[PDB]
Design an enzyme around this catalytic site. Structure first.
Site, PDB file in Angstrom:
ATOM      1  N   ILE A 105       0.824  -1.202   0.000  1.00  0.00           N
ATOM      2  CA  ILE A 105       0.000   0.000   0.000  1.00  0.00           C
ATOM      3  C   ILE A 105       0.862   1.258   0.000  1.00  0.00           C
ATOM      4  O   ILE A 105       1.993   1.248   0.491  1.00  0.00           O
ATOM      5  CB  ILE A 105      -0.942   0.038   1.218  1.00  0.00           C
ATOM      6  CG1 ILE A 105      -1.520  -1.353   1.485  1.00  0.00           C
ATOM      7  CG2 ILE A 105      -2.057   1.048   0.995  1.00  0.00           C
ATOM      8  CD1 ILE A 105      -2.697  -1.698   0.600  1.00  0.00           C
ATOM      9  N   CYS A 106       0.323   2.339  -0.551  1.00  0.00           N
ATOM     10  CA  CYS A 106       1.043   3.606  -0.614  1.00  0.00           C
ATOM     11  C   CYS A 106       0.188   4.745  -0.066  1.00  0.00           C
ATOM     12  O   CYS A 106      -0.297   5.588  -0.821  1.00  0.00           O
ATOM     13  CB  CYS A 106       1.458   3.910  -2.054  1.00  0.00           C
ATOM     14  SG  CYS A 106       2.339   5.475  -2.254  1.00  0.00           S
ATOM     15  N   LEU A 107       0.009   4.762   1.250  1.00  0.00           N
ATOM     16  CA  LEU A 107      -0.789   5.796   1.899  1.00  0.00           C
ATOM     17  C   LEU A 107       0.101   6.768   2.668  1.00  0.00           C
ATOM     18  O   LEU A 107       1.026   6.357   3.368  1.00  0.00           O
ATOM     19  CB  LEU A 107      -1.808   5.162   2.847  1.00  0.00           C
ATOM     20  CG  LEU A 107      -3.117   5.930   3.037  1.00  0.00           C
ATOM     21  CD1 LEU A 107      -3.779   6.196   1.694  1.00  0.00           C
ATOM     22  CD2 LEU A 107      -4.058   5.162   3.955  1.00  0.00           C
TER      23      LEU A 107
END
Length: 173
Positions: free
Chosen positions: A97-99
């Site tokens: 994920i890329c949050l």
């Protein structure tokens, strides 16, 4: 006050209460697109999260997400990783994920904080296929390359990548 330069091994204290309290309001504040379910109460930190957007390309793409809440919490943001496979540029096929909000002391600025909660961290994971959907510095290039060369083929391929390892069921088409 100040704590550092020493081992940290103290049975859950604040987190526990921080979860049961939040996790609860979360299941009540959660939108009509996401669905949370806990397999075992003994462990709250680790749970199963579901997100199925009814708009965009993944109008009918079911996906799961595993969120982990460390001891620091709410001192530190929980580690979330995608379990299902998706052709999303932000969410690799493996399970990354890329949050931003899920970034520690994000050198940039927009990171995590004791102000937000698992309720806000989830709201974003749902927009990952609505607005947040960015095509600049995504995790997976291909996903982005398929959009640059052709926006149609990009969305078309998704449909397959869905039914492949993801199905929602019968619904008015």
């Amino acid at each position: 006050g100040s704590s550092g330069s020493s081992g940290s091994t103290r049975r859950v204290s604040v987190r526990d209460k921080l979860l049961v309290k939040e996790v609860a309001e979360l299941e009540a504040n959660l939108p009509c697109t996401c669905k949370v379910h806990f397999p075992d109460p003994n462990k709250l930190h680790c749970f199963q999260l579901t997100v199925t957007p009814d708009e965009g390309y993944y109008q009918g793409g079911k996906f799961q997400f595993e969120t982990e809440v460390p001891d620091a919490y709410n001192m530190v943001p929980p580690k979330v990783k995608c379990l299902t496979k998706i052709w999303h540029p932000n969410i690799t096929e493996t399970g990354e994920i890329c949050l931003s909000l899920l970034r520690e002391h994000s050198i940039d600025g927009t990171g995590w904080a004791p102000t937000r909660t698992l309720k806000d961290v989830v709201w974003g994971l749902n927009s990952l296929f609505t607005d947040l959907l960015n095509f600049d510095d995504p995790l997976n290039i291909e996903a982005a390359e398929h959009h640059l060369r052709d926006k149609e083929d990009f969305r078309n391929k998704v449909d397959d990548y869905i039914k492949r390892y993801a199905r929602s069921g019968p619904s008015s088409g």
